Design an enzyme around this catalytic site. Structure first.
Site, PDB file in Angstrom:
ATOM      1  N   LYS A   1      -6.900   1.719   1.983  1.00  0.00           N
ATOM      2  CA  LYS A   1      -7.925   0.645   1.677  1.00  0.00           C
ATOM      3  C   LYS A   1      -7.717  -0.569   2.599  1.00  0.00           C
ATOM      4  CE  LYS A   1     -11.165  -1.898  -0.102  1.00  0.00           C
ATOM      5  NZ  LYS A   1     -11.100  -2.539  -1.477  1.00  0.00           N
TER       6      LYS A   1
ATOM      7  N   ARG B   1       0.854  -1.404  -0.076  1.00  0.00           N
ATOM      8  CA  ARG B   1      -0.232  -0.074   0.232  1.00  0.00           C
ATOM      9  C   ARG B   1       0.758   1.305   0.197  1.00  0.00           C
ATOM     10  NH1 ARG B   1      -4.489  -2.429  -2.117  1.00  0.00           N
ATOM     11  NH2 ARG B   1      -6.017  -2.861  -0.203  1.00  0.00           N
TER      12      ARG B   1
HETATM   13  N1  LIG Z   1       3.356 -12.197  -1.008  1.00  0.00           N
HETATM   14  C1  LIG Z   1       2.774 -11.298  -1.748  1.00  0.00           C
HETATM   15  N2  LIG Z   1       3.016 -11.422  -3.147  1.00  0.00           N
HETATM   16  C2  LIG Z   1       2.361 -10.311  -3.844  1.00  0.00           C
HETATM   17  N3  LIG Z   1       1.273  -9.432  -3.493  1.00  0.00           N
HETATM   18  C3  LIG Z   1       1.198  -9.544  -2.166  1.00  0.00           C
HETATM   19  C4  LIG Z   1       1.868 -10.386  -1.308  1.00  0.00           C
HETATM   20  N4  LIG Z   1       1.193 -10.203  -0.033  1.00  0.00           N
HETATM   21  C5  LIG Z   1       0.153  -9.140  -0.300  1.00  0.00           C
HETATM   22  N5  LIG Z   1       0.197  -8.970  -1.552  1.00  0.00           N
HETATM   23  C6  LIG Z   1      -0.670  -7.867  -2.061  1.00  0.00           C
HETATM   24  C7  LIG Z   1      -2.336  -8.455  -1.955  1.00  0.00           C
HETATM   25  C8  LIG Z   1      -2.868  -7.179  -2.042  1.00  0.00           C
HETATM   26  O1  LIG Z   1      -3.381  -6.662  -3.372  1.00  0.00           O
HETATM   27  P1  LIG Z   1      -4.779  -7.322  -4.058  1.00  0.00           P
HETATM   28  O2  LIG Z   1      -4.324  -8.712  -4.191  1.00  0.00           O
HETATM   29  O3  LIG Z   1      -5.979  -7.547  -3.112  1.00  0.00           O
HETATM   30  O4  LIG Z   1      -5.048  -6.655  -5.394  1.00  0.00           O
HETATM   31  C9  LIG Z   1      -2.225  -6.162  -1.498  1.00  0.00           C
HETATM   32  C10 LIG Z   1      -2.504  -5.653  -0.026  1.00  0.00           C
HETATM   33  O5  LIG Z   1      -2.717  -6.815   0.652  1.00  0.00           O
HETATM   34  O6  LIG Z   1      -0.864  -6.697  -1.270  1.00  0.00           O
END
Ligand SMILES: Nc1ncnc2c1ncn2[C@H]1C[C@H](OP(=O)(O)O)[C@@H](CO)O1
Ligand SMILES: Nc1nc2c(ncn2[C@@H]2O[C@H](COP(=O)(O)OP(=O)(O)OP(O)(O)=S)[C@@H](O)[C@H]2O)c(=O)[nH]1
Ligand SMILES: C=C[C@@]1(C)CC(=O)[C@]2(O)[C@@]3(C)[C@@H](O)CCC(C)(C)[C@@H]3[C@H](O)[C@H](OC(C)=O)[C@@]2(C)O1
Ligand SMILES: [Cl-]
Ligand SMILES: [Mg+2]
Ligand SMILES: [Mg+2]
Lengths: 189, 329, 190
Positions: free
Chosen positions: C178, C142
């Site tokens: 968010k 974020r």
């Molecule tokens: N290990 C990870 N690899 C890639 N994106 C991640 C990882 N952990 C959290 N996120 C992403 C998922 C969320 O995006 P969205 O998938 O919800 O679009 C955001 C905040 O939780 O960070």
């Protein structure tokens, strides 16, 4: 040579499915980091097995974003059906893990068909991936989908040969990308 | 055997004109280009007129009657869809004969004026006809800005050529990269005659200097270390005219010109003035200094004195190009 | 087997302008030429990992044109790894500037960094892909998605640690993130 060797190849007539946890930042913000990973591992392990059954090749997991394609490596004219069947299995799976774990996990599913470029990028930590406008669109279908239902495009409906009953998706009124590009969406029953 | 040639150079250097010559030489739509020709005409007259009051010192009209024609031209300047009434050509022609307007034109290197200005203004009586048909030379002078990449395919003695045309202006340069991989050779085009002008993008950077910096970036590019460069020192006709006119000295823009003498290997054209020989070879050498400094054996630079609008000079030079490409590449 | 950690510094670095640069035409081979340039960029980034000063940095993965990395995974003086991550971000900027000089572009990096506890391991039945999870990782993402071009946005707690190390920070304000609500963030100074 001038440029580094690129390990990428083009593929036409494939289907891309995207699934994403609704309110993931909210969810992981409540329970412990330990519990969250157990809930996710329980969920994604099943998805990975269902992917093998449904003839889908999983790409990667972006925390809470799960996605795979059908029609790779070997071309398949049965592709769009695999992804629909795969999305179907996912919805039931999420339901069981909602039951036995008690956690409020709900996913949106988006699907689209077209061409992709797949392979790897960089020099370190290679992880098979896909890129293309069609992949980008498929991603937006998920963002513009509905909780616990499969959201597909007109391009995916034309590969489905009319085996599934659908209803007007109205994806244009839930995502600015789909509207701007004039896409007709549908929701499978 | 397929050769992919990529055309590079700053804006208004002559890239699109080179492509046109390939079409005329190695490969109906004339009616569509009439509108573009009339636009060039309108742009040339309005630009020269708008500059009269902004120069330091300002240029005055030789005939008071023409003040009304100037008022006329300026009132239609921003008009979207101009229908080109018969009156318009009468005013433009009247203005172009006024000595004051002509003097402002002699100082065009002080503002931004398209190269086809004098060519079209000299034949207003031809273009104004309803039965008018653009000649080959008319289509070669017609200027239209390039945005994006364009591929032209031709064949010469059963040998294939794919030629890529790109926009040369700054914001357009970000597209070139998409043509770097597997390019047979690069054709770098330069406006040899633009030594006393500034580019459009900022209105301050010397045109030739911009070309020199752009060439140095290409020659030393990390993705073009083994790619040879065919250098077109374009606009030879305007260079000679400027050099001979003696009003805009080369050494007042590039001081190093004063320490320069013509080389031994110099091959002047028959009847060519020594002054012209000295200027064109100087501009070639500033470009050769850069190519000489690096690469060493991995790639080479092949200079050529050219005039894009002269189909005869282009056939001759592109043939010399076919020789270079086959000897090694 | 998985493993728990207490203080890992996670970074998400994006190139917001890339999506626009990407196009599919007959000239660029349906977007293959654009992907070639992304390959050069990711590669130039990837080799900074060979620099001794960057021994503690672990590349996790690339998300489209976003680069994800972490430090402190070699653990389990106390907080220097958080500062090394910021130094790694500066390095990427220098790699991207070099790329701009050769490809006639003007790409800019947008960074987001945070630190805290995470969980490291593999997940799913398909392949052995190492990743990290946790609220710490979510927040880091974020700090990128709500960031500014040419700036490194960090959380309040990461900001304090950066100050004890000698870094200056400017307050961006209170932004509603968010899923998290109102958070007070900061920009690292240069
Ligand atoms: N290990 C990870 N690899 C890639 N994106 C991640 C990882 N952990 C959290 N996120 C992403 C998922 C969320 O995006 P969205 O998938 O919800 O679009 C955001 C905040 O939780 O960070
Ligand atoms: N007299 C003369 N005019 C020339 C010569 N080469 C080009 N021109 C004229 O200069 C103008 C600009 O050339 P053009 O080919 O359009 O530039 P370009 O390099 O394609 O420019 P761009 O698309 O990057 S903005 C045209 O009107 C053309 O006719 C030349 O050798 N002599
Ligand atoms: C290379 C550029 C381009 C356009 C190619 C592409 O299809 C993507 O890589 C996808 C869609 C695609 O690779 C699938 C994964 C994910 C993570 C969803 C990508 C991002 O959204 C990329 O954009 C971002 C924002 O990084 C995007 C859109 O970038
Ligand atoms: Cl030029
Ligand atoms: Mg989510
Ligand atoms: Mg052009």
């Amino acid at each position: 040579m001038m440029f580094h060797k690129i390990y990428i190849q083009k593929h036409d007539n494939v289907s891309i499915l995207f699934a994403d946890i609704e309110g993931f930042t909210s969810l992981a913000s409540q329970c412990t980091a330990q519990e969250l990973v157990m809930t996710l591992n329980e969920l994604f392990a099943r998805f990975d097995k269902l992917a093998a059954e449904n003839h889908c090749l999983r790409i990667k997991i972006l925390g809470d974003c799960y996605y795979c394609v059908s029609g790779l490596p070997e071309a398949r004219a049965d592709h769009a059906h695999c992804c629909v069947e795969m999305g179907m299995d996912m919805i039931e799976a999420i339901s069981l893990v909602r039951e036995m774990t008690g956690v409020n996990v709900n996913m949106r599913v988006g699907i689209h068909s077209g061409r992709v470029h797949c392979g790897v990028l960089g020099l370190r930590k290679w992880q098979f991936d896909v890129w293309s406008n069609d992949v980008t669109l498929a991603n937006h279908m998920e963002a513009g989908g509905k909780a616990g239902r499969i959201h597909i495009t007109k391009a995916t409906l034309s590969y489905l040969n009319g085996d599934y009953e659908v209803e007007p998706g109205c994806g244009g009124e839930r995502n600015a990308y789909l509207k701007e590009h004039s896409i007709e969406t549908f929701l499978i029953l | 055997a397929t050769h992919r040639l990529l055309l590079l150079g700053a804006g208004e250097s002559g890239k699109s004109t080179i492509v046109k010559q390939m079409r005329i030489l190695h490969v109906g739509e004339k009616a569509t280009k009439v509108q573009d020709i009339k636009n060039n005409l309108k742009e040339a007259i309005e630009t020269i007129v708008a500059a009269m009051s902004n120069l330091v010192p300002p240029v005055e009209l030789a005939n008071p009657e023409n003040q009304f024609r100037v008022d006329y031209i300026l009132s239609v300047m921003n008009v979207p869809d101009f229908d080109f009434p018969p009156e318009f050509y009468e005013h433009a022609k009247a203005l172009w004969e006024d000595e004051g307007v002509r003097a402002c034109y002699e100082r065009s290197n002080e503002y931004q004026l398209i190269d086809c200005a004098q060519y079209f203004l000299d034949k207003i009586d031809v273009i104004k006809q309803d039965d008018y048909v653009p000649s080959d030379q008319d289509l070669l002078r017609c200027r239209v800005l390039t945005s994006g990449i364009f591929e032209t395919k031709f064949q010469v003695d059963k040998v294939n050529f794919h030629m890529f045309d790109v926009g040369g202006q700054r914001d357009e340069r970000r597209k070139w990269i998409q043509c770097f991989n597997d390019v047979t050779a690069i054709i770098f085009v330069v406006a040899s005659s633009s030594y006393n002008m500034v580019i459009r993008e900022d209105n301050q950077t010397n045109r030739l200097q911009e070309a020199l910096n752009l060439f140095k970036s290409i020659w030393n590019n990390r993705w073009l270390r083994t790619i040879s460069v065919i250098l077109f020192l374009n606009k030879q006709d305007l260079l000679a005219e400027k050099v001979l006119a003696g009003k805009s000295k080369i050494e007042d823009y590039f001081p190093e010109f004063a320490r320069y003498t013509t080389p031994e290997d110099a091959t002047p054209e028959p009847g060519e003035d020594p002054r012209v020989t000295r200027a064109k070879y100087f501009i070639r050498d500033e470009f050769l200094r850069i190519s000489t400094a690096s690469g060493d054996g991995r790639h080479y630079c092949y200079p050529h004195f050219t005039c894009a609008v002269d189909t005869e000079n282009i056939r001759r030079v592109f043939n010399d190009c076919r020789d270079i490409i086959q000897r090694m590449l | 087997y998985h493993q728990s950690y207490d203080c890992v510094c996670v970074m998400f670095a994006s190139i917001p302008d890339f999506k626009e640069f990407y196009t599919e035409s007959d000239v660029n081979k349906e977007g293959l030429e654009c992907l070639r340039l992304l390959n050069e960029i990711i590669a130039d980034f990837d080799d900074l990992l060979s620099k001794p000063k960057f021994s503690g940095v672990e590349k996790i993965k690339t998300i489209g044109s976003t680069y994800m990395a972490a430090t402190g995974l070699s653990a389990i003086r106390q907080y220097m790894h958080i500062g090394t991550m910021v130094e790694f971000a500066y390095a990427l900027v220098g790699k991207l500037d070099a790329i701009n000089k050769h490809s006639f572009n003007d790409f800019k990096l947008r960074v987001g960094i945070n630190h805290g506890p995470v969980i490291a391991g593999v997940i799913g039945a398909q392949k052995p892909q190492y990743d990290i999870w946790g609220n710490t990782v979510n927040v880091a993402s974020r700090m990128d998605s709500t960031g500014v071009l040419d700036k490194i946005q960090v959380t309040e707690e990461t900001s304090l640690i950066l100050q004890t190390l000698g870094y200056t920070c400017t307050c961006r304000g209170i932004i509603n993130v968010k899923g998290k609500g109102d958070l007070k963030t900061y920009f690292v100074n240069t």
